Write an enzyme that holds these catalytic residues in place. Structure first.
Site, PDB file in Angstrom:
ATOM      1  N   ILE B  31      56.370  44.186  23.439  1.00 16.80           N
ATOM      2  CA  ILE B  31      57.815  44.151  23.363  1.00 16.80           C
ATOM      3  C   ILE B  31      58.355  44.450  21.939  1.00 16.80           C
ATOM      4  CG2 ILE B  31      58.073  41.685  22.904  1.00 16.80           C
ATOM      5  CD1 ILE B  31      60.267  41.677  25.056  1.00 16.80           C
ATOM      6  N   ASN B  86      43.517  39.136  17.050  1.00 17.27           N
ATOM      7  CA  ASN B  86      43.940  38.283  15.947  1.00 17.27           C
ATOM      8  C   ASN B  86      43.563  36.847  16.287  1.00 17.27           C
ATOM      9  OD1 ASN B  86      45.350  40.418  14.704  1.00 17.27           O
ATOM     10  ND2 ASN B  86      47.294  39.831  15.614  1.00 17.27           N
ATOM     11  N   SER B  94      50.178  35.755  17.164  1.00 19.34           N
ATOM     12  CA  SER B  94      51.556  35.332  17.439  1.00 19.34           C
ATOM     13  C   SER B  94      51.775  34.517  18.705  1.00 19.34           C
ATOM     14  CB  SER B  94      52.489  36.541  17.428  1.00 19.34           C
ATOM     15  OG  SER B  94      52.023  37.588  18.259  1.00 19.34           O
ATOM     16  N   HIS B  99      44.656  37.879  23.456  1.00 19.22           N
ATOM     17  CA  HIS B  99      45.176  39.213  23.761  1.00 19.22           C
ATOM     18  C   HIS B  99      44.587  40.326  22.877  1.00 19.22           C
ATOM     19  CE1 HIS B  99      48.028  37.339  20.904  1.00 19.22           C
ATOM     20  NE2 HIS B  99      48.432  38.541  20.542  1.00 19.22           N
TER      21      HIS B  99
END
Lengths: 113, 113
Positions: B31, B86, B94, B99
């Site tokens: 997004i 990450n 985040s 993911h």
């Protein structure tokens, strides 16, 4: 296995500071670290690049990540880290032998390159 | 697959630009894209971060990479791309739902953040 530098490190023709090794992969420090802790985890099986990995190659690819997080923990990267897999030209794949990088020790930024 | 905004997306509770989906994973466009093509592949199973993936999640993790490669292909990333996972604060994670980012559509730079 392989015609690349990784080929030579896998066949033990040239030294590498090995962190971990088993029958399926090898993890060692990158000689040009982009961070305080910077190592690579590579499959002993030659897969030139992720774009050509076979469906039967997923357990092997997942193992590379599992090993990477274990190594990252042993190396004390308790604050976090980043794993990267580069593909072809746009991704910056230098050596054409699949390899996962693990970077840590410093705050990583966004975007990832 | 839990309490993060990625769980809501999996449960079809909020919309996402879904690219692919099967019984154990979902791929959708980020997004907040950092490259012409920038998508995420996530497990339906809620694993908060790579550091706590169990040894059994191995093929699942490899499956996220295989699905990412196949998606990259169908999004026209023939010149290469970069795959990134990450972990934690220094890794810049985040969302606490495992993911894989796949980025392409432009030359990625080194270091990876």
């Amino acid at each position: 296995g392989g015609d690349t530098i990784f080929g030579k490190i896998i066949r033990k023709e040239i030294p590498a500071k090995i962190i971990f090794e088993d029958d399926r992969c090898l993890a060692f420090h990158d000689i040009s670290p982009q961070a305080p802790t910077h190592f690579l985890v590579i499959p002993k099986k030659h897969i030139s690049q992720i774009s050509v990995a076979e469906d039967d190659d997923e357990s092997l690819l997942g193992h590379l990540m599992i090993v990477g997080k274990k190594c990252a923990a042993d190396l004390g990267l308790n604050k976090g880290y980043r794993m990267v897999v580069n593909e072809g030209s746009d991704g910056g794949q230098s050596v054409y032998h699949v390899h996962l990088h693990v970077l840590g020790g410093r705050q990583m930024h966004w975007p990832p390159g």
